[PDB]
Amino acid sequence: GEEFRMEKLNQLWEKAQRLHLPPVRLAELHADLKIQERDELAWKKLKLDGLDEDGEKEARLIRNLNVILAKYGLDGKKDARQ
């Protein structure tokens, strides 16, 4: 039930709100995140129904998430540990 049903998206969403992005720019990253959510969820359903056996459709998606983050400029990776 969380905004989306994919941990990656939820995790990223919580992160954005953490950056506190205004609604407008948050609709941009939230909306796109959703679009990617329709394709990402359609993916979780892909790998579930057995449509992509190598997860490429996940690849393109991930590359679309990566880009999404490189687009808003909210990537990073050296978190948690420090």
PDB file of N, CA and C in Angstrom:
ATOM      1  N   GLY A   1       0.771  -1.320   0.000  1.00  0.00           N
ATOM      2  CA  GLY A   1       0.000   0.000   0.000  1.00  0.00           C
ATOM      3  C   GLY A   1       0.752   1.287   0.000  1.00  0.00           C
ATOM      4  N   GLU A   2       2.025   1.242   0.282  1.00  0.00           N
ATOM      5  CA  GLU A   2       2.830   2.496   0.297  1.00  0.00           C
ATOM      6  C   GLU A   2       2.753   3.166  -1.076  1.00  0.00           C
ATOM      7  N   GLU A   3       2.821   4.471  -1.114  1.00  0.00           N
ATOM      8  CA  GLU A   3       2.742   5.189  -2.423  1.00  0.00           C
ATOM      9  C   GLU A   3       2.865   4.164  -3.556  1.00  0.00           C
ATOM     10  N   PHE A   4       3.956   3.452  -3.603  1.00  0.00           N
ATOM     11  CA  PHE A   4       4.136   2.407  -4.657  1.00  0.00           C
ATOM     12  C   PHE A   4       4.192   1.045  -3.971  1.00  0.00           C
ATOM     13  N   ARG A   5       4.613   0.016  -4.652  1.00  0.00           N
ATOM     14  CA  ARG A   5       4.691  -1.318  -3.997  1.00  0.00           C
ATOM     15  C   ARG A   5       6.110  -1.850  -4.178  1.00  0.00           C
ATOM     16  N   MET A   6       6.964  -1.039  -4.735  1.00  0.00           N
ATOM     17  CA  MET A   6       8.377  -1.455  -4.949  1.00  0.00           C
ATOM     18  C   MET A   6       9.250  -0.795  -3.884  1.00  0.00           C
ATOM     19  N   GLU A   7      10.054  -1.558  -3.203  1.00  0.00           N
ATOM     20  CA  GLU A   7      10.917  -0.966  -2.146  1.00  0.00           C
ATOM     21  C   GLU A   7      11.821   0.107  -2.750  1.00  0.00           C
ATOM     22  N   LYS A   8      12.397  -0.144  -3.893  1.00  0.00           N
ATOM     23  CA  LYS A   8      13.287   0.879  -4.504  1.00  0.00           C
ATOM     24  C   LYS A   8      12.538   2.206  -4.614  1.00  0.00           C
ATOM     25  N   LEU A   9      11.368   2.198  -5.188  1.00  0.00           N
ATOM     26  CA  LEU A   9      10.594   3.460  -5.329  1.00  0.00           C
ATOM     27  C   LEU A   9      10.291   4.038  -3.948  1.00  0.00           C
ATOM     28  N   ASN A  10       9.685   3.263  -3.097  1.00  0.00           N
ATOM     29  CA  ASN A  10       9.365   3.787  -1.738  1.00  0.00           C
ATOM     30  C   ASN A  10      10.638   4.405  -1.163  1.00  0.00           C
ATOM     31  N   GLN A  11      11.662   3.614  -1.062  1.00  0.00           N
ATOM     32  CA  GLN A  11      12.949   4.119  -0.517  1.00  0.00           C
ATOM     33  C   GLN A  11      13.276   5.460  -1.171  1.00  0.00           C
ATOM     34  N   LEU A  12      13.277   5.508  -2.477  1.00  0.00           N
ATOM     35  CA  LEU A  12      13.603   6.783  -3.180  1.00  0.00           C
ATOM     36  C   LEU A  12      12.602   7.874  -2.801  1.00  0.00           C
ATOM     37  N   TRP A  13      11.332   7.575  -2.813  1.00  0.00           N
ATOM     38  CA  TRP A  13      10.309   8.589  -2.451  1.00  0.00           C
ATOM     39  C   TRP A  13      10.645   9.155  -1.076  1.00  0.00           C
ATOM     40  N   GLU A  14      10.644   8.316  -0.082  1.00  0.00           N
ATOM     41  CA  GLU A  14      10.965   8.795   1.282  1.00  0.00           C
ATOM     42  C   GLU A  14      12.191   9.703   1.182  1.00  0.00           C
ATOM     43  N   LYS A  15      13.184   9.273   0.455  1.00  0.00           N
ATOM     44  CA  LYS A  15      14.413  10.103   0.302  1.00  0.00           C
ATOM     45  C   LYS A  15      14.038  11.486  -0.247  1.00  0.00           C
ATOM     46  N   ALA A  16      13.309  11.540  -1.331  1.00  0.00           N
ATOM     47  CA  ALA A  16      12.938  12.871  -1.890  1.00  0.00           C
ATOM     48  C   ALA A  16      12.251  13.695  -0.806  1.00  0.00           C
ATOM     49  N   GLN A  17      11.124  13.260  -0.307  1.00  0.00           N
ATOM     50  CA  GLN A  17      10.459  14.058   0.752  1.00  0.00           C
ATOM     51  C   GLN A  17      11.520  14.486   1.758  1.00  0.00           C
ATOM     52  N   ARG A  18      12.463  13.628   2.031  1.00  0.00           N
ATOM     53  CA  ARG A  18      13.538  13.993   2.986  1.00  0.00           C
ATOM     54  C   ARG A  18      14.265  15.215   2.448  1.00  0.00           C
ATOM     55  N   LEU A  19      14.444  15.282   1.160  1.00  0.00           N
ATOM     56  CA  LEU A  19      15.101  16.478   0.579  1.00  0.00           C
ATOM     57  C   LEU A  19      14.081  17.606   0.624  1.00  0.00           C
ATOM     58  N   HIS A  20      12.853  17.249   0.877  1.00  0.00           N
ATOM     59  CA  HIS A  20      11.761  18.265   0.966  1.00  0.00           C
ATOM     60  C   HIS A  20      11.601  19.016  -0.360  1.00  0.00           C
ATOM     61  N   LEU A  21      11.254  18.317  -1.400  1.00  0.00           N
ATOM     62  CA  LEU A  21      11.109  18.996  -2.720  1.00  0.00           C
ATOM     63  C   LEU A  21       9.692  19.572  -2.814  1.00  0.00           C
ATOM     64  N   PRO A  22       9.564  20.826  -3.181  1.00  0.00           N
ATOM     65  CA  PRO A  22       8.224  21.460  -3.292  1.00  0.00           C
ATOM     66  C   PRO A  22       7.253  20.563  -4.044  1.00  0.00           C
ATOM     67  N   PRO A  23       5.984  20.732  -3.834  1.00  0.00           N
ATOM     68  CA  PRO A  23       4.986  19.897  -4.537  1.00  0.00           C
ATOM     69  C   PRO A  23       5.243  19.883  -6.044  1.00  0.00           C
ATOM     70  N   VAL A  24       5.355  21.033  -6.629  1.00  0.00           N
ATOM     71  CA  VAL A  24       5.565  21.137  -8.100  1.00  0.00           C
ATOM     72  C   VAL A  24       6.739  20.267  -8.537  1.00  0.00           C
ATOM     73  N   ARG A  25       7.884  20.492  -7.973  1.00  0.00           N
ATOM     74  CA  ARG A  25       9.064  19.677  -8.354  1.00  0.00           C
ATOM     75  C   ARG A  25       8.885  18.279  -7.789  1.00  0.00           C
ATOM     76  N   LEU A  26       8.070  18.148  -6.782  1.00  0.00           N
ATOM     77  CA  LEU A  26       7.853  16.801  -6.206  1.00  0.00           C
ATOM     78  C   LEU A  26       6.838  16.073  -7.074  1.00  0.00           C
ATOM     79  N   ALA A  27       6.047  16.795  -7.824  1.00  0.00           N
ATOM     80  CA  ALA A  27       5.090  16.134  -8.738  1.00  0.00           C
ATOM     81  C   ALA A  27       5.929  15.696  -9.924  1.00  0.00           C
ATOM     82  N   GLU A  28       6.932  16.469 -10.210  1.00  0.00           N
ATOM     83  CA  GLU A  28       7.824  16.090 -11.331  1.00  0.00           C
ATOM     84  C   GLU A  28       8.490  14.765 -10.935  1.00  0.00           C
ATOM     85  N   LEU A  29       9.281  14.780  -9.894  1.00  0.00           N
ATOM     86  CA  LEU A  29       9.979  13.529  -9.447  1.00  0.00           C
ATOM     87  C   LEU A  29       8.968  12.479  -8.951  1.00  0.00           C
ATOM     88  N   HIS A  30       7.878  12.902  -8.374  1.00  0.00           N
ATOM     89  CA  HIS A  30       6.861  11.912  -7.898  1.00  0.00           C
ATOM     90  C   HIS A  30       6.124  11.352  -9.115  1.00  0.00           C
ATOM     91  N   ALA A  31       5.655  12.222  -9.961  1.00  0.00           N
ATOM     92  CA  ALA A  31       4.933  11.787 -11.190  1.00  0.00           C
ATOM     93  C   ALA A  31       5.836  10.859 -11.994  1.00  0.00           C
ATOM     94  N   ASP A  32       6.985  11.336 -12.379  1.00  0.00           N
ATOM     95  CA  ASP A  32       7.917  10.473 -13.152  1.00  0.00           C
ATOM     96  C   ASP A  32       8.135   9.191 -12.354  1.00  0.00           C
ATOM     97  N   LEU A  33       8.472   9.327 -11.103  1.00  0.00           N
ATOM     98  CA  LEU A  33       8.677   8.118 -10.267  1.00  0.00           C
ATOM     99  C   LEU A  33       7.462   7.207 -10.449  1.00  0.00           C
ATOM    100  N   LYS A  34       6.285   7.774 -10.523  1.00  0.00           N
ATOM    101  CA  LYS A  34       5.076   6.931 -10.737  1.00  0.00           C
ATOM    102  C   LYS A  34       5.194   6.304 -12.124  1.00  0.00           C
ATOM    103  N   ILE A  35       5.329   7.119 -13.128  1.00  0.00           N
ATOM    104  CA  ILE A  35       5.461   6.555 -14.495  1.00  0.00           C
ATOM    105  C   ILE A  35       6.427   5.378 -14.378  1.00  0.00           C
ATOM    106  N   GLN A  36       7.628   5.634 -13.932  1.00  0.00           N
ATOM    107  CA  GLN A  36       8.590   4.526 -13.752  1.00  0.00           C
ATOM    108  C   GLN A  36       7.938   3.472 -12.861  1.00  0.00           C
ATOM    109  N   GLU A  37       6.999   3.862 -12.034  1.00  0.00           N
ATOM    110  CA  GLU A  37       6.332   2.861 -11.151  1.00  0.00           C
ATOM    111  C   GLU A  37       5.399   1.993 -11.995  1.00  0.00           C
ATOM    112  N   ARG A  38       4.772   2.557 -12.987  1.00  0.00           N
ATOM    113  CA  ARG A  38       3.863   1.742 -13.837  1.00  0.00           C
ATOM    114  C   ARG A  38       4.708   0.768 -14.641  1.00  0.00           C
ATOM    115  N   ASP A  39       5.880   1.191 -15.002  1.00  0.00           N
ATOM    116  CA  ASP A  39       6.792   0.298 -15.772  1.00  0.00           C
ATOM    117  C   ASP A  39       7.548  -0.611 -14.797  1.00  0.00           C
ATOM    118  N   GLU A  40       7.878  -0.101 -13.644  1.00  0.00           N
ATOM    119  CA  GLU A  40       8.593  -0.927 -12.637  1.00  0.00           C
ATOM    120  C   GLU A  40       7.625  -1.964 -12.102  1.00  0.00           C
ATOM    121  N   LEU A  41       6.457  -1.548 -11.712  1.00  0.00           N
ATOM    122  CA  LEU A  41       5.471  -2.536 -11.230  1.00  0.00           C
ATOM    123  C   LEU A  41       5.170  -3.467 -12.400  1.00  0.00           C
ATOM    124  N   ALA A  42       4.898  -2.917 -13.555  1.00  0.00           N
ATOM    125  CA  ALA A  42       4.655  -3.792 -14.729  1.00  0.00           C
ATOM    126  C   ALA A  42       5.850  -4.737 -14.828  1.00  0.00           C
ATOM    127  N   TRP A  43       6.980  -4.299 -14.337  1.00  0.00           N
ATOM    128  CA  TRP A  43       8.163  -5.190 -14.358  1.00  0.00           C
ATOM    129  C   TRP A  43       7.992  -6.249 -13.270  1.00  0.00           C
ATOM    130  N   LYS A  44       7.880  -5.848 -12.029  1.00  0.00           N
ATOM    131  CA  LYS A  44       7.719  -6.868 -10.961  1.00  0.00           C
ATOM    132  C   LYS A  44       6.728  -7.908 -11.480  1.00  0.00           C
ATOM    133  N   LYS A  45       5.742  -7.471 -12.219  1.00  0.00           N
ATOM    134  CA  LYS A  45       4.762  -8.429 -12.789  1.00  0.00           C
ATOM    135  C   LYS A  45       5.414  -9.141 -13.970  1.00  0.00           C
ATOM    136  N   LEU A  46       6.342  -8.501 -14.643  1.00  0.00           N
ATOM    137  CA  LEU A  46       7.030  -9.188 -15.772  1.00  0.00           C
ATOM    138  C   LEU A  46       7.820 -10.356 -15.200  1.00  0.00           C
ATOM    139  N   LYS A  47       8.775 -10.061 -14.361  1.00  0.00           N
ATOM    140  CA  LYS A  47       9.596 -11.146 -13.768  1.00  0.00           C
ATOM    141  C   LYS A  47       8.671 -12.145 -13.066  1.00  0.00           C
ATOM    142  N   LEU A  48       7.568 -11.696 -12.508  1.00  0.00           N
ATOM    143  CA  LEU A  48       6.633 -12.650 -11.842  1.00  0.00           C
ATOM    144  C   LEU A  48       5.995 -13.568 -12.885  1.00  0.00           C
ATOM    145  N   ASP A  49       5.464 -13.010 -13.935  1.00  0.00           N
ATOM    146  CA  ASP A  49       4.811 -13.851 -14.977  1.00  0.00           C
ATOM    147  C   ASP A  49       5.870 -14.547 -15.835  1.00  0.00           C
ATOM    148  N   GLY A  50       7.115 -14.184 -15.690  1.00  0.00           N
ATOM    149  CA  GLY A  50       8.175 -14.844 -16.502  1.00  0.00           C
ATOM    150  C   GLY A  50       8.199 -14.256 -17.916  1.00  0.00           C
ATOM    151  N   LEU A  51       8.406 -12.972 -18.040  1.00  0.00           N
ATOM    152  CA  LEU A  51       8.452 -12.357 -19.396  1.00  0.00           C
ATOM    153  C   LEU A  51       9.888 -11.939 -19.714  1.00  0.00           C
ATOM    154  N   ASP A  52      10.597 -11.418 -18.750  1.00  0.00           N
ATOM    155  CA  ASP A  52      12.029 -11.066 -18.961  1.00  0.00           C
ATOM    156  C   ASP A  52      12.830 -12.072 -18.137  1.00  0.00           C
ATOM    157  N   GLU A  53      13.574 -12.974 -18.725  1.00  0.00           N
ATOM    158  CA  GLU A  53      14.324 -13.945 -17.881  1.00  0.00           C
ATOM    159  C   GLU A  53      15.704 -13.397 -17.526  1.00  0.00           C
ATOM    160  N   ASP A  54      16.062 -12.245 -18.023  1.00  0.00           N
ATOM    161  CA  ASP A  54      17.400 -11.683 -17.690  1.00  0.00           C
ATOM    162  C   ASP A  54      17.196 -10.360 -16.965  1.00  0.00           C
ATOM    163  N   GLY A  55      15.964  -9.975 -16.791  1.00  0.00           N
ATOM    164  CA  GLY A  55      15.664  -8.708 -16.077  1.00  0.00           C
ATOM    165  C   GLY A  55      16.096  -7.497 -16.908  1.00  0.00           C
ATOM    166  N   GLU A  56      16.227  -7.623 -18.205  1.00  0.00           N
ATOM    167  CA  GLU A  56      16.635  -6.421 -18.987  1.00  0.00           C
ATOM    168  C   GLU A  56      15.538  -5.372 -18.815  1.00  0.00           C
ATOM    169  N   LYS A  57      14.316  -5.743 -19.073  1.00  0.00           N
ATOM    170  CA  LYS A  57      13.208  -4.767 -18.903  1.00  0.00           C
ATOM    171  C   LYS A  57      13.423  -4.081 -17.556  1.00  0.00           C
ATOM    172  N   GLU A  58      14.061  -4.779 -16.657  1.00  0.00           N
ATOM    173  CA  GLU A  58      14.404  -4.181 -15.344  1.00  0.00           C
ATOM    174  C   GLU A  58      15.618  -3.302 -15.600  1.00  0.00           C
ATOM    175  N   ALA A  59      16.455  -3.767 -16.473  1.00  0.00           N
ATOM    176  CA  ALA A  59      17.665  -2.984 -16.825  1.00  0.00           C
ATOM    177  C   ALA A  59      17.174  -1.653 -17.363  1.00  0.00           C
ATOM    178  N   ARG A  60      16.520  -1.650 -18.485  1.00  0.00           N
ATOM    179  CA  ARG A  60      16.030  -0.357 -19.025  1.00  0.00           C
ATOM    180  C   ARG A  60      15.380   0.427 -17.889  1.00  0.00           C
ATOM    181  N   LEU A  61      14.497  -0.196 -17.163  1.00  0.00           N
ATOM    182  CA  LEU A  61      13.833   0.524 -16.041  1.00  0.00           C
ATOM    183  C   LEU A  61      14.899   1.101 -15.106  1.00  0.00           C
ATOM    184  N   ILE A  62      15.728   0.258 -14.564  1.00  0.00           N
ATOM    185  CA  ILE A  62      16.807   0.728 -13.647  1.00  0.00           C
ATOM    186  C   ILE A  62      17.566   1.870 -14.306  1.00  0.00           C
ATOM    187  N   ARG A  63      17.895   1.715 -15.550  1.00  0.00           N
ATOM    188  CA  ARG A  63      18.614   2.813 -16.263  1.00  0.00           C
ATOM    189  C   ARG A  63      17.681   4.025 -16.333  1.00  0.00           C
ATOM    190  N   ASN A  64      16.393   3.795 -16.283  1.00  0.00           N
ATOM    191  CA  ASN A  64      15.425   4.929 -16.320  1.00  0.00           C
ATOM    192  C   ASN A  64      15.288   5.489 -14.906  1.00  0.00           C
ATOM    193  N   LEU A  65      15.621   4.699 -13.925  1.00  0.00           N
ATOM    194  CA  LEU A  65      15.590   5.202 -12.529  1.00  0.00           C
ATOM    195  C   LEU A  65      16.886   5.972 -12.364  1.00  0.00           C
ATOM    196  N   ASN A  66      17.963   5.315 -12.664  1.00  0.00           N
ATOM    197  CA  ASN A  66      19.288   5.960 -12.617  1.00  0.00           C
ATOM    198  C   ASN A  66      19.176   7.312 -13.308  1.00  0.00           C
ATOM    199  N   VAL A  67      18.795   7.315 -14.552  1.00  0.00           N
ATOM    200  CA  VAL A  67      18.639   8.605 -15.273  1.00  0.00           C
ATOM    201  C   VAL A  67      17.724   9.510 -14.447  1.00  0.00           C
ATOM    202  N   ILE A  68      16.563   9.029 -14.095  1.00  0.00           N
ATOM    203  CA  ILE A  68      15.645   9.875 -13.289  1.00  0.00           C
ATOM    204  C   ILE A  68      16.452  10.552 -12.182  1.00  0.00           C
ATOM    205  N   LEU A  69      17.203   9.787 -11.438  1.00  0.00           N
ATOM    206  CA  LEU A  69      18.011  10.380 -10.333  1.00  0.00           C
ATOM    207  C   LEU A  69      19.068  11.324 -10.904  1.00  0.00           C
ATOM    208  N   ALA A  70      19.701  10.948 -11.976  1.00  0.00           N
ATOM    209  CA  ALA A  70      20.734  11.837 -12.574  1.00  0.00           C
ATOM    210  C   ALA A  70      20.044  13.080 -13.143  1.00  0.00           C
ATOM    211  N   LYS A  71      18.757  12.999 -13.336  1.00  0.00           N
ATOM    212  CA  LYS A  71      17.995  14.148 -13.899  1.00  0.00           C
ATOM    213  C   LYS A  71      17.654  15.128 -12.784  1.00  0.00           C
ATOM    214  N   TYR A  72      17.189  14.628 -11.676  1.00  0.00           N
ATOM    215  CA  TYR A  72      16.866  15.538 -10.547  1.00  0.00           C
ATOM    216  C   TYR A  72      18.169  15.862  -9.833  1.00  0.00           C
ATOM    217  N   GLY A  73      19.126  14.995  -9.974  1.00  0.00           N
ATOM    218  CA  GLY A  73      20.429  15.206  -9.291  1.00  0.00           C
ATOM    219  C   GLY A  73      20.288  14.707  -7.859  1.00  0.00           C
ATOM    220  N   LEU A  74      19.669  13.573  -7.696  1.00  0.00           N
ATOM    221  CA  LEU A  74      19.476  13.001  -6.345  1.00  0.00           C
ATOM    222  C   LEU A  74      20.007  11.568  -6.332  1.00  0.00           C
ATOM    223  N   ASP A  75      21.149  11.341  -6.922  1.00  0.00           N
ATOM    224  CA  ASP A  75      21.707   9.966  -6.948  1.00  0.00           C
ATOM    225  C   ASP A  75      22.443   9.698  -5.639  1.00  0.00           C
ATOM    226  N   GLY A  76      23.734   9.552  -5.698  1.00  0.00           N
ATOM    227  CA  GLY A  76      24.508   9.271  -4.456  1.00  0.00           C
ATOM    228  C   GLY A  76      24.578   7.759  -4.243  1.00  0.00           C
ATOM    229  N   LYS A  77      25.221   7.315  -3.196  1.00  0.00           N
ATOM    230  CA  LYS A  77      25.311   5.848  -2.953  1.00  0.00           C
ATOM    231  C   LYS A  77      26.081   5.587  -1.656  1.00  0.00           C
ATOM    232  N   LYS A  78      27.003   6.445  -1.317  1.00  0.00           N
ATOM    233  CA  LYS A  78      27.788   6.240  -0.066  1.00  0.00           C
ATOM    234  C   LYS A  78      26.965   6.702   1.139  1.00  0.00           C
ATOM    235  N   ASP A  79      25.798   6.150   1.322  1.00  0.00           N
ATOM    236  CA  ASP A  79      24.953   6.560   2.480  1.00  0.00           C
ATOM    237  C   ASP A  79      25.176   5.585   3.639  1.00  0.00           C
ATOM    238  N   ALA A  80      24.150   5.311   4.402  1.00  0.00           N
ATOM    239  CA  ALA A  80      24.296   4.367   5.546  1.00  0.00           C
ATOM    240  C   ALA A  80      25.740   4.385   6.052  1.00  0.00           C
ATOM    241  N   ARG A  81      26.524   3.416   5.666  1.00  0.00           N
ATOM    242  CA  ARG A  81      27.942   3.376   6.125  1.00  0.00           C
ATOM    243  C   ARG A  81      28.561   4.768   5.989  1.00  0.00           C
ATOM    244  N   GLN A  82      29.570   5.055   6.764  1.00  0.00           N
ATOM    245  CA  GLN A  82      30.216   6.398   6.680  1.00  0.00           C
ATOM    246  C   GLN A  82      31.577   6.353   7.378  1.00  0.00           C
TER     247      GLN A  82
END
